Structure formats: structure tokens, C-alpha cells
Amino acid sequence: LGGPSVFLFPPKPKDTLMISRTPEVTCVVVDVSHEDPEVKFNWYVDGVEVHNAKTKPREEQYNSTYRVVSVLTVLHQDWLNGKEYKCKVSNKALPAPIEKTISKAKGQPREPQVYTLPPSRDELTKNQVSLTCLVEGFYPSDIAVEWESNGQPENNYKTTPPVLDSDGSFFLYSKLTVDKSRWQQGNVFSCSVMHEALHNHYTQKSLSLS
């Protein structure tokens, strides 16, 4: 081949925001040859070499290459503070080592403003209604938006990707679809939002028939 290729991934936003979860940075090496499957990983947190990464089981891709993966567990506060994680990949098929970096997006974090918008009167003639959650003025774009009702998750929703606003912050909309009868029953639906800039990384906004 033309030697291996490296892809370095950040932790899952929900994992960095929940103390009950473990965030991790993932260094993926593709196009590892059968002749030289040996991959050396060097990891750096702000230039300081760390020794606690773990290698995931080697996987055969079925295109005559291997997928070699190193996972480094990060501290919630370290990721949220803006520390840079560097993965240095060494293999015989590479002329020189490949170094890739990841870190949280730079810029002063901004608190999201969460607004639940009830269905439009014109939609109150259909079998299902749309409940909207506007999430705006947040920075960075890393967020988790979910819906619940009566302590149970409501899974019939779709969230738009974050849109860059004119003021340098982000916005998105989450749309929950419910049967009209369920909205007419007076059931309270909540929009749970997770972001670093919220008090306790969490906010919940509710709505019911008025």
C-alpha cells in the first residue's frame, strides 16, 4: 500500500458531561499490512507522554489490511479545560511517524438557552404533532439533546446538526413526534440538554397542552 493512515477521535459529548460515564480518545490506524502488523503508539497530553492507553483487539478488515486501535481514557475536567491529546503512530511501512491531535474547540464556552415550542394550531388536525426544542447561543457545538415523558425516554425524535449563528455561537432544534391523543391527554414532555456551560452540565425544559 501507501502505508497506514491515522484517524483520531474525541470522546462522546455525553461521556465528557456525565461524571457517571468514562470519556476516551480513540486513535484508529487503518491500512496496516499483514507483513508489518506491528504498530507503536505514543500518547501525549499537552506534550507530556502518558502510559495508560490500551490496545483494542486487532480486527481483520477483509481487504488484506488490519485495523489497529489505541484507546486513551481522559479526565472529564482535562477535556473540558482544553488539553490536547496527541497520538504518535509508528510502523515499518511509514517513512516517518504520523502524529495526529484532538482537543475541544477553542473559544469561551457559552451557555445554551433552551426553549420548548408547542405544536402550531394548523398541525392540531393531524394524527401526530411536533414538539420543538430550540437550543441556542451555545459554545462549543458539543451537546446532547434528548426527550422524556413521565420518567421514560421518548425515542421518536430527530435533532438537527448544530448551525453556526451570526454571533459565533451555535443553535439546533430537536423535534419530537407524538400521537395527537397523547398531546391532548395532558402528558408532559421534557427536553433534556447536556452542555459544559450549563449549571451541572444539565437543563430540562417541559411542555404540555395549554
Binding site: 456525565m18 461524571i19 434528548e146 433534556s192 451541572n200 444539565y202
Partner: peptide, 13 residues
């Protein structure tokens, strides 16, 4: 105070 999401701990101040 603490924040909880579906009975799971989010964070405490």
C-alpha cells in the same frame, strides 16, 4: 446541588 438524567448522575456543584 446535583443534576440527574433518567436516574443517572450528571454533575454536582
Amino acid at each position: 446541588d446535583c443534576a440527574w438524567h433518567l436516574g443517572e448522575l450528571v454533575w454536582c456543584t
